[PDB]
Each structure stands twice: as structure tokens, then as C-alpha cells.
Amino acid sequence: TPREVTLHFLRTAGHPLTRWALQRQPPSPKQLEEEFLKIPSNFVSPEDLDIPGHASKDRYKTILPNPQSRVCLGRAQSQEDGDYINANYIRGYDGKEKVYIATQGPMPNTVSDFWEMVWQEEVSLIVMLTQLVHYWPTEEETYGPFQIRIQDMKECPEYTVRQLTIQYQEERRSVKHILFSAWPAHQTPESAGPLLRLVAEVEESPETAAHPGPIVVHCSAGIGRTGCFIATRIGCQQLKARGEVDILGIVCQLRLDRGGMIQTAEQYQFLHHTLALYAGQLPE
Numbered sequence: 001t002p003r004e005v006t007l008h009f010l011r012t013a014g015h016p017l018t019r020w021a022l023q024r025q026p027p028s029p030k031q032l033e034e035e036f037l038k039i040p041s042n043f044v045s046p047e048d049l050d051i052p053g054h055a056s057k058d059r060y061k062t063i064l065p066n067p068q069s070r071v072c073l074g075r076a077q078s079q080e081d082g083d084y085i086n087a088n089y090i091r092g093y094d095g096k097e098k099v100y101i102a103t104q105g106p107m108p109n110t111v112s113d114f115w116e117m118v119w120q121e122e123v124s125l126i127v128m129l130t131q132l133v134h135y136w137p138t139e140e141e142t143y144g145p146f147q148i149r150i151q152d153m154k155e156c157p158e159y160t161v162r163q164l165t166i167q168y169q170e171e172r173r174s175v176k177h178i179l180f181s182a183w184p185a186h187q188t189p190e191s192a193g194p195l196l197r198l199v200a201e202v203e204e205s206p207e208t209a210a211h212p213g214p215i216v217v218h219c220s221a222g223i224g225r226t227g228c229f230i231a232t233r234i235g236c237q238q239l240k241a242r243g244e245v246d247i248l249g250i251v252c253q254l255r256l257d258r259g260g261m262i263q264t265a266e267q268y269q270f271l272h273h274t275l276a277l278y279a280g281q282l283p284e
Helices: 002-012 019-024 029-038 108-120 192-203 224-242 247-257 265-280
Strands: 016-018 087-090 100-104 125-129 140-143 146-155 159-168 171-180 215-219 244-246
Touching: 002 247, 016 019, 019 244, 019 265, 029 265, 087 247, 100 108, 100 224, 108 140, 108 146, 108 159, 125 192, 125 224, 159 192, 171 192, 192 224, 192 265, 215 224, 224 244, 224 247, 224 265, 244 247, 247 265
Parallel strands: 100 215, 125 171, 125 215
Antiparallel strands: 016 244, 087 100, 140 146, 146 159, 159 171
């Protein structure tokens, strides 16, 4: 039973690494390559989704949101004739539910869907990962029923922070948007420092809500760079709380949430490098 075999692996696989082992005696580059290749994709086949006309809202044919964690658009603000967006809820540290939503970058025809999701899910933070569509405005623009305005734009060494507001009827909400460039698909960032500063930027973001909404994280396909970013943050949280990290377990849990998260063995190895660097910053 290939399905049961996949699910059993993802629910049980693990390779705990103490802070010491991570820094001083990590698995060899060959061991990490073989370990990465063993992780099932958990990609859903087009047959496992019965959402007609979903293909026009997917950037890629074979990268699809797993039904169990798929973000469904209730259309409370619109008259749109479906529920579909290529996006999944992602669990965070210790399996906490709906900490993130991983999604593809909006297509010209899914920009309104994207802002609908941001409203419906009470998103206040968006992390965009890219290399050098513009679904946010220069000053002010309307997307479907939503009015979006930019209040501030700040250029940091490695990312740009925009403060936006989104308004529907009487209600206007703040949304922080972080655009991290110099990260090509199927590659790693230039070095781990900027990525760890991005993770810190996210941590430091003020949370106003009583029950915080998911952090939206996106990139072109919504799995490689999003998976690296989310795995990095969860790994840091594990190191800080427990003084050890199970990177294999983190990636397996991400794949349960959205098929294919973290695309390449080089990205998986870079996660180890990044977390070994973060470990040096911890107390003691």
C-alpha cells in the first residue's frame, strides 16, 4: 500500500541531533543526500482532487494542495464560483496547528483569491521569497472587494519590509509584508546569516490578535523555498526550547502538510548548516 507506506514513514521517521552533534559531528554530506532521497514527496495526484477548473489557478501541473490541509475559500466577501486556492495550512513548532499557510505566488487571475485568503484567515504577516506578480500596490489599489494601501516601505540589507492595510467595508487591518530577494528556486540563499535575520524579523513582528492568524509564506511553486524557510524557523524553535533538533522529522511533518516541501538535497544540507550556525547564538 504505497499510500500507507508513505504516511507511516512521514509519521514515524526521525533523526534527533543534539546541539553538539549538529555543530561538531553532523551526518556526512553523503548521509544527508541518501536521507533526503528517502523522504516521500507526499504529492497528491490530480485524481485525488475533484476540484473542476483548479488547473487554471495552479502555476504548475504537479504541485497541488493536499486536500486534508488545503485552504478553502468560503467566499464570505465575494460572489466567486469556487473555493480553490493552491495553499495549505502548515503546522509549526510541536505540531501547533495553522501557524503558517504555504502557497504559490499569486497568478494574475488569483490575486483576488490571495487577498480573500489573507482576509478570511486574519493574516497579518506575509513572507515572500524570490530572486531578482506585483500583487500589492504602489500607493493604493482595489482587489475584488478589498482596498489595499501601503503605509510604509523600509529597505533592510537583505529584505524589504512593507506595512500595508487591507480594508473591507468598515474594517481595516494591518499586514506586514517582507520580501526576501536573492533566493532562486531550487537553490539556497547566498549564506545562512540573511536567512536567520529574516527568521528574527518574523519573530520580532508584533502580534495584535487574540488568536494569531497563520503567517503566509510564498514563492513561485510554494514548496521549495517556503519549506526551507518554515523548516528553518521550526528548527530554531526546537534548538532554543530543547537544545536538540530533529531535522528529518521537521521535513517529514512539512510533507504531511503540503507535498514536496524542500525540493533539493542541497537545500536539506543548507538547513543543517543554517541550524548549526543558529546553535552558536544560543545560551549556554
